[model samples]
Target chain A: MKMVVVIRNDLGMGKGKMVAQGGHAIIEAFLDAKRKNPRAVDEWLREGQKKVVVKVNSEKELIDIYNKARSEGLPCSIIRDAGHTQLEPGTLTAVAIGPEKDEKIDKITGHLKLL
Target chain B: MKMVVVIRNDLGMGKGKMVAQGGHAIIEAFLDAKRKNPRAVDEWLREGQKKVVVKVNSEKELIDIYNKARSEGLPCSIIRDAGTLTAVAIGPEKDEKIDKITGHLKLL
Candidate 1:
């Protein structure tokens, strides 16, 4: 089915600058996962394809991640399923969550029934 | 140059479903503002063009605004300057703020 992975960082991790790097790493990990599981990738690309959604806790963080994705050859597209909220400024907290990438992949594949 | 306006809502406003309406009203206000000030629009569009950025406190709220803008023929494009954050869930506290719609028109 679809694979969804969530990533949360430690308190004050990167102070506002680490989010982009963190997001990029997460996405790269997902792509690498797909590469290792070609059958799943093929199944996903053919049917039950998954749409990636990266959620951030701040606009700056989102922009950073967007820039990294663009540099890595991934075009940044807005997801209709995405949203935002406000947290304490300057002060950091534990933030970051993504669906298990593989799980998201599986969900899409399963939806497509490409097994 | 560019003009900026901030919009904020009253305490405990709209519960959860009112963001879409709130956003639409803000955008519509901006458009009307432009209509009333064509000179500014022409000057800005031709020269110091500004991109509009809508900030929200929730993804669902963003989606609401996105859908409303789409219905009005606006494409939902990602803003390079936009971001998200986490607030206490439920127990609605003071929320809803937008840049002055008319001020946004002046910017664009």
Candidate 2:
């Protein structure tokens, strides 16, 4: 079972207001995940915490956000995909971080199944 | 027996005039190296042309110059050192061109 966390920054608006509005989408996604597989959701919720992967377009922004998250002692990862390239089955780059190696891999599947 | 070719860009004045002025410094450095060790100079000069390394302070400028030279059929390289970091033996990052394996090494 996997849980995803989506983070959004205020686009000229207020941060507090943006987070409040964005929180709804995150809750909906979680609920959808749970409905898809009850047992998986139970296990995932039981765990104290889950790894987070952030998808960002700009390299500079990715570095800034990753560094901020790391400084805060939060566990997070980055998934970078070529912005200029066309979206295809194998066009994305998936990177994982935990107690293992950080690497770049090419996968054919669109969805990433985290254990 | 090593010889270094240093390429200089005109500093706003004029390209032809700048090259002519800068060439003097290059010749002086080469002559100084030769006088220090004649055998080394003889071997280096005999090799015809040596590798030219250009050092620029700006990363964007480096990329632009390198790409321009590359497009003109001339090889190039880029060295990115932490411009904000301290100046010492333990500092700086080096990158090279022509071959990947022979490029610069990063910090400690």
Candidate 3:
């Protein structure tokens, strides 16, 4: 199993902001996975928490992949900024797709580039 | 209450790598806090999970802050990239406590 964190390149967020958002997305996704598929969550932790941090060009693109992953029964989360330093409150900034099989996540985000 | 994630400026990790390490550090620190200071964790969550992403210059510097935070009874976690320690997260505690340990660091 692997987790895929999807960052929005269009946000023009600072590096720290990006990392913080990814942190939010990751934990939410993991908790969601634990609730929905505990076994997959265990496999992810046991497998060294393998992950791919990929980029999306826009909100639409991020949402598309997130929806696709969820439709396929993968645990996922989308993050919104709190507007503290860099972005507006409630701005959608990043997404996490899965801790499911690598191939399953790949099917949703395979074409994306590393951030 | 707020979480402060410290990244190593010396690691030369790319943006994505830093983000991933930050993710790992956040979860570990949160879990640790849940075990040792559950009320703070609950307060933190209710308070919007506030966080700061900061940087240290080297592994030793990172360790120093980690030790200080831990010694002060602040919930913290350090992450390693296989071998090299790369990130540290401090608190979900009172802002002043986390600041006392990581206050001198610069934001990433």
Candidate 4:
């Protein structure tokens, strides 16, 4: 089991900003899974909470992936910047997709490159 | 309110690795806050779940920050890589409280 975070590389966010955005997506997605799919969460935690970071070039690409992942019945969460730092408020920054079966997640995000 | 992740810059971890490590620390710390300080978690979430990523030079520095944050009556979590401590996350508590422990650290 693994969690995949899709970030917008085109945003040119600082390393810390990307990391922080990914963390928010990860936590939100994890919480979603914990509430909706407890068994998957249990299996994921038992496996060292494996995770991956992937990149997309724009907001459109990021949201496309999010939509496909959600339509596929995966637990995912999208993140928006709060305008406290670099990006403007409500700017879509990242998406976290699953701590579910590797095969299941890869089906939706297999085309993305690692960030 | 904010959550801060203190990472070991000396570990030579790749960007992806560091991001993943920070994500791990974030989730664990959020869980701790949810259970031990639900009010902070609620306020943090309501405030857009603001977060920060900072860098430390070594395990000693990382642990020192972790202990300091913990001693402050904050909800915190540390992430270990196989066995080595890689990162620590502190507080979905007030920004002022978190800054007292991690304010001086460099951004990751």
Candidate 5:
């Protein structure tokens, strides 16, 4: 099992800001899963919390995946930047999909490059 | 409250790799805090799970902050990759103390 963090490379987001967004996305996604799918959260914890960070070309690519995950009934979270730092306000900068199975996540992100 | 995730810039880690590490560190550090410092963990949870990603220049700098956080009675975790101590995640702590240690650095 693993969590997949998807970042937007087109934002040209600096590594630091990108890391922050990813961090927020993980916490949010975890909380969402814990609420909606507690068993997946427990399984993730038992699996030592494996994760893969990958990239998408743009916000469009990200949302396509986000919707696909939701339609597949997977737990997902999309991060909209608060504009407190880099980029602009409400930018769809990152998305975290699941503390679910790798097989399920791979169906959506297997073609994406590793970050 | 906040968690300070320290990354080493000298490593020149790609954003994706760094982001993965940051996510892992948060889970590890949070679990550690839950075990040893339950209330701090509770407070951080109540505080909206605030976090800050910052950087250090070398492993030495990363270790220094990790040591300080531990000695100060704060919960912390360090991550290693290929024998390198690549990242440190500290806290679920208050802003001032977290700032006292990481204030000089820029946000990530």
Candidate 6:
């Protein structure tokens, strides 16, 4: 299943942490997809693990995209700040969509610029 | 190019922001690879953009991995936290070489 990771640039995380959080999204969304349909995850891995990153300005904007995922019924997960460094606890940071169909993902996130 | 991202759990960033940083490292490293030899980056994209992420305890471990990459002469970039080099992205290179350095660490 192809994956789309929507990033919140608003958080201003250090570079190292940002990478981890994104990796978290990738693996978590992957497991979610794997749970729903193992074949989808296998196809994605076989296809080279394509992942797209996009930007949102604020938590509200991120949640807006998240709601779009829910409305579309795609398997998804949202990243919230761990509160160890700069941000407060539970601040939303990223939303992960898919390991699903391409057109379905395009419908939700295609309009956004790639990050 | 196959790549490995070394992360620090100590900094404690949220998930979304973490993705951006890794994306930043990927794109930035891709750009660096593109400048040196466009063919390398093209091959990686064509091969499916494979990537690996691993963790470290603090900044020191991150730099150690980066220095290992340096010694190997891989195309590498280290992330800075307040002027301290705290994270690293090594290769969009070969999986074998990546495994050589990072095989010891578990997946993130």
Error of 4 at B75 (Å): 1.0
Evaluate all candidate structures by whole-model CA lDDT and list the values in order.
0.30, 0.31, 0.88, 0.89, 0.83, 0.69
Where does candidate 4 stray beyond 4 Å? A83-90
Using TM-score as the yardstick, the better of models 2 and 5 is 5
Residues B20-80, candidate 1, lDDT per residue (tens digit)? 1222232233344355565654454354233232234445544454444444432122111
Candidate 4 lDDT, tens digit per residue, B32-92?
A: 8899879769988887888888899999999999999889988899999876999999988
Native contacts matched by each model? 0.00, 0.00, 0.78, 0.87, 0.85, 0.35
Model 5 C-alpha lDDT per residue in residues A1-113, reported as the tens digit of each score: 89999988888788778887888788878878889889889989777678789889888999998998899888889988767557546688889999888899899878889
A9-59 per-residue lDDT for model 3 (tens digits): 987889999988898888789878989999988888787787789999899
Clashes of each: 45, 0, 0, 0, 2, 10
| Error of model 4, residue B84, in angstroms | 2.5
Model 6 root mean square deviation, Cα atoms: 12.0
Candidate 2, residues A6-45: lDDT per residue as tens digits?
2322123232222222222233333344454456545544
TM-score of chain B of each: 0.31, 0.42, 0.96, 0.95, 0.88, 0.85
TM-score per prediction, in order, is: 0.24, 0.24, 0.93, 0.92, 0.86, 0.54
List model 1 lDDT by residue over A19-83, tens digit each.
22222333333345445555654554343333332234544554444344344433122211112
lDDT of 3 by residue, B8-105 (tens): 98889999999988877887898889889788788888877888999999999999999998899888999988789989998778999898998888
Worst lDDT run of 10 residues, candidate 2 chain B, spans B84-93
Q: For candidate 4 chain B, which ten residues in a row score worst on lDDT? A: B31-40
**lDDT against true structure, model 6:** 0.69
For A1-115, candidate 4 gives per-residue lDDT tens digits of 9999998998778878888989889988998888879999988988889999999999999999999998998999998876655654668999999988999999999889999
lDDT at position B67, candidate 5: 85
- Cα deviation at B64, candidate 6, in Å, is 11
TM-scores of chain A across candidates: 0.30, 0.39, 0.92, 0.93, 0.91, 0.88
